[PDB]
Design an enzyme around this catalytic site. Structure first.
Site, PDB file in Angstrom:
ATOM      1  CG  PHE A 205      44.258   4.105 -63.730  1.00  0.00           C
ATOM      2  CD1 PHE A 205      45.164   4.705 -63.172  1.00  0.00           C
ATOM      3  CD2 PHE A 205      44.700   2.739 -64.244  1.00  0.00           C
ATOM      4  CE1 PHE A 205      46.055   4.086 -62.211  1.00  0.00           C
ATOM      5  CE2 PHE A 205      45.828   2.327 -63.827  1.00  0.00           C
ATOM      6  CZ  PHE A 205      46.407   2.711 -62.685  1.00  0.00           C
TER       7      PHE A 205
ATOM      8  CE1 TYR B  21      37.997  -4.249 -72.668  1.00  0.00           C
ATOM      9  CE2 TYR B  21      39.124  -6.058 -71.593  1.00  0.00           C
ATOM     10  CZ  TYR B  21      39.218  -4.716 -72.030  1.00  0.00           C
ATOM     11  OH  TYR B  21      40.409  -4.153 -72.082  1.00  0.00           O
TER      12      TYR B  21
HETATM   13  O1  LIG Z   1      44.130  -4.843 -65.157  1.00  0.00           O
HETATM   14  C1  LIG Z   1      44.096  -5.508 -66.288  1.00  0.00           C
HETATM   15  O2  LIG Z   1      45.117  -5.184 -67.325  1.00  0.00           O
HETATM   16  C2  LIG Z   1      42.895  -5.949 -66.845  1.00  0.00           C
HETATM   17  O3  LIG Z   1      41.971  -5.803 -65.684  1.00  0.00           O
HETATM   18  C3  LIG Z   1      40.811  -6.299 -65.938  1.00  0.00           C
HETATM   19  O4  LIG Z   1      40.761  -7.646 -65.741  1.00  0.00           O
HETATM   20  P1  LIG Z   1      40.521  -8.485 -64.420  1.00  0.00           P
HETATM   21  O5  LIG Z   1      42.033  -8.618 -63.838  1.00  0.00           O
HETATM   22  O6  LIG Z   1      40.180 -10.004 -64.655  1.00  0.00           O
HETATM   23  O7  LIG Z   1      39.531  -7.944 -63.220  1.00  0.00           O
HETATM   24  P2  LIG Z   1      39.593  -7.338 -62.164  1.00  0.00           P
HETATM   25  O8  LIG Z   1      38.165  -6.916 -61.752  1.00  0.00           O
HETATM   26  O9  LIG Z   1      40.472  -6.205 -62.282  1.00  0.00           O
HETATM   27  O10 LIG Z   1      39.787  -8.550 -60.807  1.00  0.00           O
HETATM   28  C4  LIG Z   1      40.745  -9.393 -60.945  1.00  0.00           C
HETATM   29  C5  LIG Z   1      40.272 -10.774 -60.492  1.00  0.00           C
HETATM   30  O11 LIG Z   1      40.275 -10.601 -59.022  1.00  0.00           O
HETATM   31  C6  LIG Z   1      38.854 -11.051 -58.489  1.00  0.00           C
HETATM   32  N1  LIG Z   1      38.094 -10.054 -57.652  1.00  0.00           N
HETATM   33  C7  LIG Z   1      37.938  -8.797 -58.178  1.00  0.00           C
HETATM   34  C8  LIG Z   1      37.460  -7.879 -57.240  1.00  0.00           C
HETATM   35  C9  LIG Z   1      36.959  -8.104 -56.018  1.00  0.00           C
HETATM   36  O12 LIG Z   1      36.386  -7.207 -55.259  1.00  0.00           O
HETATM   37  N2  LIG Z   1      37.008  -9.451 -55.555  1.00  0.00           N
HETATM   38  C10 LIG Z   1      37.697 -10.315 -56.408  1.00  0.00           C
HETATM   39  O13 LIG Z   1      38.026 -11.320 -55.731  1.00  0.00           O
HETATM   40  C11 LIG Z   1      38.060 -11.756 -59.709  1.00  0.00           C
HETATM   41  O14 LIG Z   1      38.839 -12.956 -59.988  1.00  0.00           O
HETATM   42  C12 LIG Z   1      38.851 -10.635 -60.965  1.00  0.00           C
HETATM   43  O15 LIG Z   1      38.663 -10.893 -62.071  1.00  0.00           O
HETATM   44  C13 LIG Z   1      40.219  -6.072 -67.422  1.00  0.00           C
HETATM   45  O16 LIG Z   1      39.517  -7.187 -67.981  1.00  0.00           O
HETATM   46  C14 LIG Z   1      41.372  -5.885 -68.612  1.00  0.00           C
HETATM   47  O17 LIG Z   1      40.550  -5.011 -69.479  1.00  0.00           O
HETATM   48  C15 LIG Z   1      42.359  -5.154 -67.889  1.00  0.00           C
HETATM   49  O18 LIG Z   1      43.667  -4.956 -69.161  1.00  0.00           O
END
Ligand SMILES: O=C(O)[C@H]1O[C@H](OP(=O)(O)OP(=O)(O)OC[C@H]2O[C@@H](n3ccc(=O)[nH]c3=O)[C@H](O)[C@@H]2O)[C@H](O)[C@@H](O)[C@@H]1O
Ligand SMILES: NC(=O)c1ccc[n+]([C@@H]2O[C@H](COP(=O)([O-])OP(=O)(O)OC[C@H]3O[C@@H](n4cnc5c(N)ncnc54)[C@H](O)[C@@H]3O)[C@@H](O)[C@H]2O)c1
Ligand SMILES: NC(=O)c1ccc[n+]([C@@H]2O[C@H](COP(=O)([O-])OP(=O)(O)OC[C@H]3O[C@@H](n4cnc5c(N)ncnc54)[C@H](O)[C@@H]3O)[C@@H](O)[C@H]2O)c1
Ligand SMILES: O=C(O)[C@H]1O[C@H](OP(=O)(O)OP(=O)(O)OC[C@H]2O[C@@H](n3ccc(=O)[nH]c3=O)[C@H](O)[C@@H]2O)[C@H](O)[C@@H](O)[C@@H]1O
Lengths: 375, 367
Positions: free
Chosen positions: B21, B170
Site C-alpha cells: 500500500f 506487533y
Molecule cells: O493505520 C495505522 O496507522 C495503523 O493501523 C493498524 O492499527 P489499528 O488502527 O488499531 O487497527 P485497524 O484494524 O486498522 O482498525 C482500527 C480500529 O477500528 C475498529 N474496527 C476495525 C475493523 C472493523 O471492521 N470494525 C472495527 O470496528 C477496531 O477498533 C480497530 O482496531 C496497525 O496496528 C498499525 O500498524 C498501523 O500503523
C-alpha cells in the site's frame, strides 16, 4: 511431596546463568533442600566454586559445571536435550549499561535467549524464563499531578501480572532498551506457549536482595563498574564513603530477601500443574522504601553490624546525567500484586527489610572489609 | 531544490515492501515528482503492475535471500516497509508478527550500518499504544488536558497491555526495532529516520476479501468497511466502535516521506509522527461518515441499520486490546520539514470511496 499432594519426581535441570547471583543461590536450595540434578551453564563459576567437585566432592554427581557461552556454542542444544527443565537466567541486568551498551543489552535479553526458547519448544522441554518487574516500567500513577488523590488508589500503582500495562519512556530514553527486550521475550515465550504448546513459567523479580549480588568495584568486580544499589551502597559503607543518591533517591522499590524468593522459584519447579502457563511477581510488598530510606536504613544497620559508627553526612545527591549517563529514565514505584503467585503456589515473603539487611550487610562486612583495607 | 535551499542530487533508492500500500503510492510520487531511481523489492508486485512494463522490480523475500546485501549496496538509501501490519493477526499469528516486525528487519539494519547507507524505517503510531488518559475515570477532567492524549515523539511513553493481550506483539516488536535503530544510530553512526504513520488512508490499502484477497481475511478498517458498503452489508463495529483515530490522506502523507528523503540534514536523527490531527473520529463516526459519502459516490442510498455492534471476542479473537486515541503531535515534523496535511477526512473519503466503487463494484456483482 508437591502442593497438589503428589510426590516429587526428581529432575535433571539445565540452569543457564547458573553462576550468577540468582543462579548461585538457586543451586544451593536445589542441592540442599531437594532431589534434583543441576547442569550449571555459565561463562564464569566464581559464585558456585564453593559447590564444585574441585573445591568439594559432597555433591559429586548432582551438579556439573559446563563453561559454555550461549551466544554461539553447538554444545547447547544437547545440554538442553540432556535435561527435563531449563531455567534461563543468562542476561545483562545492570541498569548502568542499558543506556550505554543498548545494543549488547538488547541482544543479551532478547536475541541470545531465542535459541533457548527454540530448543525447549522443539524438544518438548519445560522452560522457566527470568524476566523482571522492569517489564511494567512506570506506574500509571506517575503521570498524575504531584499529590493528586488518584495516586492513593492502588488502581494506579500496584502491578498485577495479568492486567497492568507495560509503560516505558520515549525511544530516546535508552534505559528502556532492557525493559523492551524483556517485554518482547515474554511476549514471544507466551505466544510460543499459545501458537505451539510450550510449557513455561515466567518470573518477574522485584528487587531480590542477598549476598553475591553483583560485585564490589575494585575487588571482585572492576574499578569503573556500576552495579545495582545493594552492591553500590555496600561499597560506600565498606569504603566509608557517603552513599550516592541519584536525583535525591525519591524512587521507591520493594526488596525481598533472596532466600524468600528462592523458595518461590522452588515451588514453581515442583508444581508445574500450577506454574505452567503463568507469569509471577516475586516480591515482598511490605518492604517498600524510597532509595533515600534504603540508604538511611543501610547506614544504620551497617553501623550495628560494623561496630564503627555514623558518617558526617552519610549520603549525598547526584544528578542522573552525572551518575547513569545520557538517556536515563526510572521505574518510579514497584509494588508487586500477590494474588496470582499467592493463589497458585501459596507463597509469601517471611523476611523483613531490616532483617534481610542485617543478614546481607554482615555477609558484606565479613567478606569485604579485610580486603577493602588492603587497597 | 531541497528545503535547506541546496539542489537535490538524485538517488538510487532500495525500497523494501515496495509493492505494498504505502510502497506503491511512494513509487508513484518518486517517479512522477522526482529524479530518483527506485529498486522495488517485494514478494508481490500486484500494486505496481500498472506502473511496470528508473524502476526495477526484484521478486525477493528478505527472510532468506543472499541477493539482498548487494541490492542494498546497489542503492544510496534504503526504505524498509516490509512488515505484517494487519491488527487481525497480531493475536493469532503472534510469532510470525514478531519475527516479521523485529527479527526479519535486523539484517536490513546490519547492512545499512555496515555499508554506511541511510535508512528510513517505517514503524507505527501503535508504538505509543494506549494514551495515559485512558486509565483515568470515565469523564475525569484530566482527560481534557492534552498532556494526557497527545502523542509527542520525543517524550510520550509507549504504553501496552499485559502480556496475555497478544495484540501488542506487533507494537512491542515495532518498539524494539525502533530502539535498536536508534541505538545503532547512537553506538554506531547510522544515518536514519523513523516514520510513525497514524492511520494513512487511500487507494490500494489491504484487499477486498474474496476479490483482492482471501474470502475469510480481515484487513484494516478502510478495506473492511469498503467491503461492507460494496457488498451492501452493514459495517461491523468492534465493541461499539468507540476508539478514536486520526486519518491522513495517503497523498498528504507521501509528501511528508518525500521531504524526509530529500532533506537528510533535517531528517537524519529524528522520529516523525505522520498524521492529520484535524481528521479525528470514533470508529462509529468513520462508519457513519463512510456510508454517507458512499451513498453520494454510489448513487445507491442508505441501509436499514447501516451498522451493527460486534464483540471483539467474536471479531478479532482471544487476546485483543486496542489503541484508544491517536492524535499526533506534529511539533517535530512541522519544525523539521514544514509539513502539514492539506486533505480533509470527508474529502479523502470521497476520493478513496470513488476509487473503491470504480474498482470493486462490477467485480463484487459477479460473485
Ligand atoms: O493505520 C495505522 O496507522 C495503523 O493501523 C493498524 O492499527 P489499528 O488502527 O488499531 O487497527 P485497524 O484494524 O486498522 O482498525 C482500527 C480500529 O477500528 C475498529 N474496527 C476495525 C475493523 C472493523 O471492521 N470494525 C472495527 O470496528 C477496531 O477498533 C480497530 O482496531 C496497525 O496496528 C498499525 O500498524 C498501523 O500503523
Ligand atoms: C532478572 O533476573 C535474572 C537473573 O538475575 P541475576 O541477579 O542472577 O543476574 P546475574 O548476572 O548474577 O546471573 C546471570 C548469569 O548469566 C550469565 N550470562 C550472561 N550471558 C551469558 C552467556 N552468553 N552464556 C552463559 N552465561 C551468560 C552471566 O555471566 C551471569 O553469571 C536475569 O535474567 C535478569 O534479567
Ligand atoms: C506501518 O507502515 C509500514 C507499511 O505499511 P503498508 O500499509 O505499506 O503495508 P503493506 O503490506 O501494504 O506494505 C508492506 C509490503 O511488504 C512486503 N513484505 C512483507 N514481508 C516481506 C519479505 N519478507 N520480503 C519482501 N517483502 C515483504 C509485503 O509483501 C507488502 O507488500 C509498515 O512497516 C507498517 O509496520
Ligand atoms: O533487581 C531487580 O529486580 C531489578 O533491578 C534493576 O532495576 P532498578 O531497581 O531500577 O535499578 P538499581 O540500579 O538496582 O537501583 C534502583 C534505583 O535506585 C537508584 N540508585 C541506584 C544505585 C545507586 O548507587 N544509587 C541510586 O540512587 C536508581 O534510581 C535506580 O534505578 C534491574 O534493572 C532489573 O533487571 C531487575 O529486575
Amino acid at each position: 511431596v508437591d502442593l497438589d499432594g503428589k510426590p516429587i519426581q526428581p529432575l535433571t535441570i539445565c540452569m543457564i546463568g547458573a553462576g550468577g547471583f540468582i543462579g548461585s543461590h538457586l543451586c544451593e536450595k536445589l542441592l540442599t533442600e531437594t532431589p534434583h540434578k543441576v547442569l550449571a551453564l555459565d561463562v564464569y563459576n566464581d559464585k558456585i566454586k564453593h559447590l564444585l567437585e574441585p573445591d568439594t566432592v559432597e555433591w559429586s554427581g548432582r551438579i556439573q559445571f559446563h563453561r559454555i557461552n550461549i551466544k554461539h556454542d553447538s554444545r547447547l542444544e544437547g545440554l538442553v536435550k540432556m535435561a527435563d527443565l531449563i531455567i534461563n537466567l543468562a542476561a545483562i541486568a545492570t541498569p548502568a549499561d542499558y543506556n550505554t551498551r543498548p545494543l549488547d543489552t538488547i541482544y543479551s535479553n532478547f536475541i541470545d535467549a531465542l535459541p533457548v526458547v527454540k530448543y525447549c519448544s522443539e524438544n518438548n522441554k519445560r522452560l522457566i524464563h527470568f524476566s523482571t518487574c522492569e517489564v511494567y516500567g512506570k506506574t500509571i500513577g506517575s503521570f498524575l499531578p504531584k499529590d493528586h488523590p488518584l495516586r492513593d488508589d492502588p488502581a494506579f500503582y500496584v502491578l498485577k501480572e495479568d492486567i497492568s500495562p507495560c509503560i516505558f519512556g520515549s525511544i530516546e530514553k535508552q534505559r528502556w532498551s532492557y525493559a523492551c527486550a524483556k517485554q518482547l521475550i515474554e511476549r514471544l515465550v507466551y505466544a510460543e506457549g499459545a501458537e505451539n504448546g510450550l510449557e513455561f513459567t515466567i518470573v518477574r523479580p522485584f528487587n531480590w536482595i542477598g549476598p553475591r549480588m553483583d560485585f564490589i568495584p575494585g575487588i571482585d568486580g572492576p574499578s569503573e563498574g556500576v552495579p545495582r544499589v545493594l552492591a553500590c551502597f555496600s561499597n560506600n559503607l565498606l569504603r566509608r564513603e557517603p552513599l550516592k543518591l541519584v536525583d535525591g533517591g525519591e524512587s521507591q522499590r520493594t526488596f525481598v530477601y533472596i532466600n524468600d524468593a528462592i523458595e518461590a522459584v522452588l515451588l514453581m519447579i515442583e508444581n508445574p500443574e500450577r506454574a505452567n502457563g503463568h507469569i509471577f511477581n516475586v516480591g515482598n510488598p511490605n518492604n517498600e522504601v524510597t532509595v533515600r530510606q534504603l540508604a538511611e536504613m543501610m547506614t544504620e544497620v551497617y553501623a550495628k553490624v560494623s561496630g564503627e559508627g555514623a558518617i558526617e553526612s552519610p549520603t549525598v545527591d547526584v544528578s542522573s546525567k552525572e551518575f547513569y549517563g545520557e538517556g536515563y529514565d526510572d521505574s518510579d514505584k514497584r509494588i508487586p500484586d500477590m494474588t496470582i503467585i499467592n493463589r497458585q503456589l501459596g507463597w509469601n515473603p517471611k523476611t523483613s527489610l531490616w532483617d534481610l539487611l542485617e543478614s546481607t550487610l554482615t555477609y558484606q562486612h565479613r567478606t569485604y572489609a579485610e580486603a577493602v583495607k588492603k587497597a
